[PDB]
């Protein structure tokens, strides 16, 4: 429920301080190997809930190389989940293809949003 | 006039229903003595009210 | 949910009748119209029209059961009475 | 027949089709029923609700 | 899409009150249904209140309706609404019944209909034959050892059937105390068996009294179907309430306001006026074994109804023959109620096992003889030849 | 019957109330069929397809 | 559900056989009179019941322009019964209208039907 | 087509339990609805059978349930079924509503489905409560006392409405027979919600323990599940076995085989076990009318829960402080339940009101703020800006 824009406001922000950068960064690395959904051979925005009017539009814009593959990320890890067991190291999820590669066609969807709910409410200067 | 009873009364139906109620508390109230009186009437000198004054004077 | 059998009935817009070609229908609103208009004297003669189509299919089965029903009462009435106590024996035993 | 030419509704049609006028009339016939109706909804749930209250010999014990 | 349409439960009265397709023609008699459904509110809601000053116990049960009229705030009310209500119950239900059998309601497209509601008929007898032995009147408790002891004439484990229903060795404490139990139980089946009544009737939807297909001319039920049924809503509460005030003691029995004595027998011993014509079959067979077969039967021949009808026309409107036979049926059944209220004498023995042929006659040799001539007369009287 | 007196007066009300919504629901019922009961059907049989 | 091969070969009878006919057809002119669908504007083979495979065959191969008016009789019976009325005299189906239309469909259709159940149990002799 | 798809009935039948498309990882949390059906009909068929035995008079309340277990023929196991079995009643959904509660089953597509079950769940802490007071032992007739007394701190109208309830001047025969009544009606309301229930689940189905579509999977319910359900099935009926035959009475209180005594207060009064985490709470606020508000504001925070979780992804499993935090509201519960069974002390009526605290605070607070800042993290964490 909240808002992708408003967690891109506030991690950029942060992103952006030296400071605040030095010690955020650090233990959100240590947050994200603790969460373990690499090792089910799945990347972060695979988990997103998509039963939502916004992310049913940015999954109908994926480019279709790239929804074929998120079909068997997501089928394989309910096969292994099935079975109690983890995937071999060898198949887990590396660091840099951990990627946000949904994250663009969201943050363009909800921009579309937000300016027709500013248009329904229009006041002229009368 | 026929068309200010209607702006009054019936185009709004937090009116209509509002005076329906008034008018049910109205008749709830007025029809149970007309009631009772008509009845008590109807059978004069039965009553336990009639017979206490036959044996009080 | 999956589909069910094939029925004889559908819904608004594929009710699953004929085909309707060439037929116009009329009708005016309620509130210019007069409700309770021929009233009286519906009650008269669409009354009398309507009993007299009907009565002896009704009348001549409940007359004949009535009857029977009278004439088996009065047997019983002689009976179990003085005037008809022989016959009670026979019947009975 | 064409079917530009609508059939005759003389016989069932007021001769005098007011919309406030004849407004009134029918919403004071379905008031009259919401009235009555109301009454006897009250006389409903008291008598079931009052019989749910202390009895006669319960009382005759204070 | 409405909210009416969309939502999940919305959906359901939607399609069952405000937008179900009706034909356009269906008459007065297509109101009893609706009619079924208030009796059976009536009768629980009642029941319920009733119930929070009952005791079920042989020594308190009589003793607890008196403080019901008595000592209970508008309990007189609703005792005789609960009493005479079950009454205008079996009224209604013996007409909604008619009313199938005369438009022929009963036929192919709608078999399964009409078998579920034979068996919501057999689950109401036994409902209103538990309740009346709640009271444990004289007509109470010896009606209950006359119906309870006719299992006694089963072959083999007959009197285990017997011995397992009273709880003892006759009516006593432990049976008293166990009817009221499925008493309060039974109504609640009811009321499940109505669901899948209605269930069954959405398929095809209703008839119409011309007997002929209704999808050429349909119209919503809402606003057109619920203000003419409140129309025999308020004629139904009329009726009611002159029997409740004015006459609350006309159908019933005297003797049933006389405690329970297992020592004296009354004169008379009959059930309620509404089980009175199959109490009258059951006495027309000389034997207990075939006599208890022969009553639950007489239930059970409804179901070959879809079969012996050999017409090619549903319905009885513009039939002559099939329609001076139904009303000889109707006052058939008439005469069997009243011979059930009359004592074993000379004449009536005789009149009985004559009208309980005329009963399984009209189903089993009446209708298909009659149904198969009026087919040939069809025909020859229009195709010259 | 210590009821007696007390029933008949109730009554005396529940007949008067519901005698009249009958009737009143008997003009509401036809006031709504209006458009129904008053319907024209014509049949121009159409020219062959 | 006495299919309309039984009713035919039993009526067809009686026509050929000058005795019975000249007994039996005034007793069935005096019973259709008596029966009143012609009161309401409507033919005989109107009122037969259609909820089965076997009718709705025939209805489908009927031509058109007997469908439509077909169909016109039907809507002005259930108006007219609505009203609790009948027709005005000069409305009603003569005699000489009142035709067997349908019945050579229903004929056909149920001639093929019981061929395929004789076919269905055959048993070949030698 | 089959006809189990083509019938009216069957179709119904297989639309649910048999072709019922199901998520292939679920794991065995969520075997515990299909327990629950079992609970209730277990429920239901023990009572109606000890109920042919019973009298609800108070003077003859706490004799019946005696005559239970020494007279009728296995009645012992009847009763010890009926007392145990609740109390198993409340440990399967305790757990069932913790399995939705940590997997995120009550988020945006299933709201409607989570506000029917806080229903059941009101209903059957009513039930519950309704049946104890019919044994009418000491802690049955004190433990009434308290709690009908809370309704009189309502403005105005509130010493009315406890008159209205007792039907009297005090906890008396008209309220033990009231309260039987009310007891044989309210679990079929709870059976026509569960119908309910499961119609409001149809729409979108189940959830998974991943937290993510499970349109890409699916096997059928029937072989598959059906046999997966029957192994808990087995488990839930051994230990029941062993608490009914071996250890009966090790649920309940001493004090409640001592018959109700109006004059004599029997020191502590506590509810059952399964109702003392709500009535610690009620007693942390020193005052009537607010302490009264806020015992039933803990059954109605549950519905606040679908709009104070600002998580983008459903569920605990892949969460650090989450899954860290559901397990301190989980034994805050446990300890909420040991004070209400504590007397009111020193150290403990400090300790109660600050578990309170917690408990209110976990909704309204802790969810909110915890779930903002893992999606933080989850994007800090791997975007290089
Ligand atoms: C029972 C269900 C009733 C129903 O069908 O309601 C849906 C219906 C929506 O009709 P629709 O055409 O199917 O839906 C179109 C859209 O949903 C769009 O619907 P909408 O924009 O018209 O919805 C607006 C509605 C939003 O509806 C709600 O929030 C429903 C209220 C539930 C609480 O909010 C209101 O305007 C409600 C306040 C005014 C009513 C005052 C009556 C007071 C007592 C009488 O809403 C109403 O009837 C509004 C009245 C709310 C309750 C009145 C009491
Ligand atoms: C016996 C009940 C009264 C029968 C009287 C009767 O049948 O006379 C016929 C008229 C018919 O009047 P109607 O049924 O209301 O139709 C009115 C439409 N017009 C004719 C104006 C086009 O009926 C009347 O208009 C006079 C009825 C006045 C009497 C009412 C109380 C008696
Ligand atoms: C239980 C008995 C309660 C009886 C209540 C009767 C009642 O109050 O009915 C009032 C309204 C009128 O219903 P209406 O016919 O749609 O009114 C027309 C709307 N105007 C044009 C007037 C604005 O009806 C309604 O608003 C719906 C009431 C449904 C109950
Ligand atoms: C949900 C179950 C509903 C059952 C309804 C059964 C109806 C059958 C008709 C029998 C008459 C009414 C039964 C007794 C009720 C009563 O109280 O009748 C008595 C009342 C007047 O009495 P009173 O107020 O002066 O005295 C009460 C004691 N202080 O008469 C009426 O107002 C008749 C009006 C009936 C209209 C009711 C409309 C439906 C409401 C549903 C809510
Ligand atoms: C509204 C109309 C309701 C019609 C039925 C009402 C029953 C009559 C009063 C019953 C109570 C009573 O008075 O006692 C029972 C009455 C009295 O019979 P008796 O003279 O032998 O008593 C002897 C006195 N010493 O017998 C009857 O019921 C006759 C049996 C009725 C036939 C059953 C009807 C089945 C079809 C019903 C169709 C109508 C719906
Ligand atoms: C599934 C479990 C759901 C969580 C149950 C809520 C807390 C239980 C109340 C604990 C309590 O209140 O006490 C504990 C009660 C009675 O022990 P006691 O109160 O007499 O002594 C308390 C001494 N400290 O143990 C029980 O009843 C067992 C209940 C079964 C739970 C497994
Ligand atoms: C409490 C009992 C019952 C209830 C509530 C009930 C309810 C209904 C309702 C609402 C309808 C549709 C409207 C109508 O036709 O009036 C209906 C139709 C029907 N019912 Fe019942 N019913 C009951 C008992 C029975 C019984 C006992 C039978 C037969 C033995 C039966 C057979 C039928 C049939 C055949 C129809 C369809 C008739 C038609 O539409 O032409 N029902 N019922
Ligand atoms: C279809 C529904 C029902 C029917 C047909 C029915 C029928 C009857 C009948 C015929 C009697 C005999 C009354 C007399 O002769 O004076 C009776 C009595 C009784 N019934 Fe019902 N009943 C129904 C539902 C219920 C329910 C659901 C309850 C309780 C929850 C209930 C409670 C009682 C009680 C307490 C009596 C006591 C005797 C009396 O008050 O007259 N009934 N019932
Ligand atoms: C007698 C009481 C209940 C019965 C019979 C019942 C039955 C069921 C069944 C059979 C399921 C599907 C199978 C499963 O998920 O294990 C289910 C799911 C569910 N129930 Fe219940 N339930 C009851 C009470 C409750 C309560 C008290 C709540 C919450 C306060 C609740 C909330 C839910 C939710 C949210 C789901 C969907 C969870 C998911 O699929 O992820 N239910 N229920
Ligand atoms: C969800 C359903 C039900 C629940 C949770 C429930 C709960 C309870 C509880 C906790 C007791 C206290 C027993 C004790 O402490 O020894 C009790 C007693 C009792 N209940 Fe139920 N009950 C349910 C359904 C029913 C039904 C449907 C009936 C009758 C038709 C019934 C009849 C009784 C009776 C007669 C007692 C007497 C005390 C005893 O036998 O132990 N119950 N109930
Ligand atoms: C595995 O799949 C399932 C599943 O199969 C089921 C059933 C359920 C449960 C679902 C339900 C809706 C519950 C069903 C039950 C009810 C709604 C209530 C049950 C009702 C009863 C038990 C009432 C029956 C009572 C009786 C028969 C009374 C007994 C008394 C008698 C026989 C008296 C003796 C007779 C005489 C004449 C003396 C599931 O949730 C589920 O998971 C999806
Ligand atoms: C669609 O066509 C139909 C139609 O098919 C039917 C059946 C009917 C007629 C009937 C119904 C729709 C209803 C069907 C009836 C049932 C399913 C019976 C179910 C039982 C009830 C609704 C009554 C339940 C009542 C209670 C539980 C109340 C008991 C009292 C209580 C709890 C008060 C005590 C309170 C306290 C605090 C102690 C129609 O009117 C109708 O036209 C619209």
């Known amino acids: 429920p909240q808002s992708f824009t408003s967690i891109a406001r506030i991690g950029d922000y942060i992103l952006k301080s030296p400071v605040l950068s030095k010690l955020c960064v650090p233990v959100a690395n240590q947050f994200i190997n603790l969460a373990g959904y690499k090792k089910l051979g799945l990347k972060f925005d695979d988990l997103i809930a998509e039963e939502n009017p916004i992310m049913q539009t940015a999954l109908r814009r994926l480019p279709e190389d790239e929804s074929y593959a998120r079909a068997y990320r997501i089928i394989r890890a309910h096969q292994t989940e099935l079975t109690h067991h983890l995937l071999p190291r060898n198949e887990w999820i590396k660091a840099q293809e951990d990627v946000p590669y949904l994250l663009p066609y969201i943050l363009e969807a909800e921009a579309a949003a937000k300016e027709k709910d500013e248009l329904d409410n229009i006041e002229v200067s009368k | 006039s026929f068309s200010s009873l209607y702006k009054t009364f019936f185009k709004r139906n937090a009116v209509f229903v509002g005076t329906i109620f008034a008018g049910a508390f109205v008749f709830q109230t007025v029809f149970d003595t007309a009631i009772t009186s008509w009845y008590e009437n109807h059978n004069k000198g039965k009553l336990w009210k009639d017979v206490k004054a036959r044996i009080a004077a | 949910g999956p589909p069910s059998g094939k029925t004889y009935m559908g819904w608004w817009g594929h009710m699953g009748g004929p085909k309707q070609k060439g037929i116009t229908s009329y009708a005016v609103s309620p509130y210019a119209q007069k409700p309770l208009q021929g009233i009286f004297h519906n009650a008269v003669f669409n009354s009398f029209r309507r009993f007299k189509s009907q009565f002896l299919y009704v009348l001549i089965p409940a007359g004949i059961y009535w009857y029977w029903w009278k004439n088996g009462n009065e047997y019983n009435e002689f009976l179990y009475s003085k005037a008809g106590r022989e016959e009670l024996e026979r019947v009975n035993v | 027949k064409s079917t530009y030419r609508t059939p005759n509704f003389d016989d069932v049609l007021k001769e005098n089709n007011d919309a406030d006028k004849g407004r009134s009339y029918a919403y004071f016939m379905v008031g009259a029923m919401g009235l009555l109706s109301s009454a006897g909804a009250k006389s409903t749930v008291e008598t079931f609700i009052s019989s749910m209250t202390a009895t006669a010999d319960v009382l005759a014990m204070a | 899409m409405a909210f009416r349409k969309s939502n999940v439960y919305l959906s359901l009265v939607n399609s069952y009150i405000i937008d179900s397709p009706q034909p356009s023609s269906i008459n007065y008699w297509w109101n009893m249904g609706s009619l079924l459904g208030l009796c059976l509110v009536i009768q629980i809601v009642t029941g319920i209140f009733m119930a929070m000053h009952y005791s079920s116990n042989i020594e308190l049960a009589f003793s607890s309706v008196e403080h019901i009229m008595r000592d209970v705030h508008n309990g007189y009310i609703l005792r005789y609404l609960h009493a005479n209500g079950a009454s205008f119950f079996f009224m209604v239900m013996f007409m909604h019944m008619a009313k199938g059998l005369y438009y022929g309601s009963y036929r192919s497209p709608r078999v399964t209909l009409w078998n579920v509601g034979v068996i919501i008929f057999i689950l109401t007898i036994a409902t209103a034959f538990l309740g009346y032995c709640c009271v444990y009147g004289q007509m109470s408790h010896w009606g209950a050892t006359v119906i309870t002891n006719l299992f006694s004439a089963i072959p083999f484990v007959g009197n285990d059937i ?182 074993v004498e000379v004449p009536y023995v005789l009149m009985g096992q004559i009208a309980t042929f005329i009963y399984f006659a009209y189903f089993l040799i009446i209708v298909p003889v009659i149904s198969t001539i009026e087919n040939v007369l069809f025909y020859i009287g229009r195709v010259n030849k | 019957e210590p009821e007696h007196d007390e029933r008949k007066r109730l009554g005396l009300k529940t007949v008067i109330i519901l005698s009249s919504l009958y009737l009143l629901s008997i003009w509401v019922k036809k006031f709504k069929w209006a458009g129904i009961k008053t319907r024209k059907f014509v049949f121009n049989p159409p020219k062959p397809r």
Chains 1, 7 share one sequence.
């Open chain 5, 162 to 343: 017997v011995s397992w229903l009273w709880g003892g060795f006759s009516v006593s404490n432990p049976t008293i105390q166990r009817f009221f139990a499925l008493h309060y139980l039974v109504p609640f089946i009811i009321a499940a068996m109505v669901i899948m009544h209605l269930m069954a009737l959405h398929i095809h939807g209703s008839s119409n009294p011309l007997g002929i297909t209704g999808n050429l001319d349909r119209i919503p039920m809402h606003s057109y179907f619920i203000f003419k049924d409140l129309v025999t809503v308020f004629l139904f509460m009329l009726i009611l309430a002159l029997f409740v005030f004015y006459s609350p003691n006309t159908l019933g029995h005297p003797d049933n306001y006389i405690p329970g004595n297992p020592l004296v027998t009354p004169a008379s011993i009959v059930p309620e006026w509404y089980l009175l014509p199959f109490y009258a079959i059951l006495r027309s067979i000389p034997d207990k074994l075939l006599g208890v077969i022969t009553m639950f039967a007489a239930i059970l021949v409804l179901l070959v109804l879809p079969f012996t009808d050999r017409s090619v026309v549903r319905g009885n409107t513009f039939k002559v023959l099939s329609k001076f036979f139904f009303f000889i049926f109707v006052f058939n059944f008439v005469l069997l109620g009243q011979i059930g209220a009359c004592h």
